[PDB]
Amino acid sequence: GEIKGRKTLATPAVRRLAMENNIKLSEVVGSGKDGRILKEDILNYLEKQTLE
Numbered sequence: 001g002e003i004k005g006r007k008t009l010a011t012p013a014v015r016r017l018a019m020e021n022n023i024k025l026s027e028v029v030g031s032g033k034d035g036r037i038l039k040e041d042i043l044n045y046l047e048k049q050t051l052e
Contacts, residue, residue, distance in 0.1 A: 003027070010037040021046050 008015060008025035009032040015025050028045045030037035 007032055008037060009033060009035050011035075014039065014042060018042060018046075 003026065006026060009030070010025070014037065018025050018028060023046060025037065026032070028037055028041055029048075030041045
């Protein structure tokens with residue numbers, strides 16, 4: 001399940017944010033279409049544990 005693509009669609013404040021919690025931006029839940037990756041996606045991602 002390797003991913004090869006460093007792309008993201010969101011404000012410059014949302015990007016660094018994910019960094020504060022040691023989390024990328026492409027791995028976060030979203031569509032990366034036109035700002036799809038919003039706070040609702042980040043807050044929901046940082047909380048959602050994707051490891052098991």
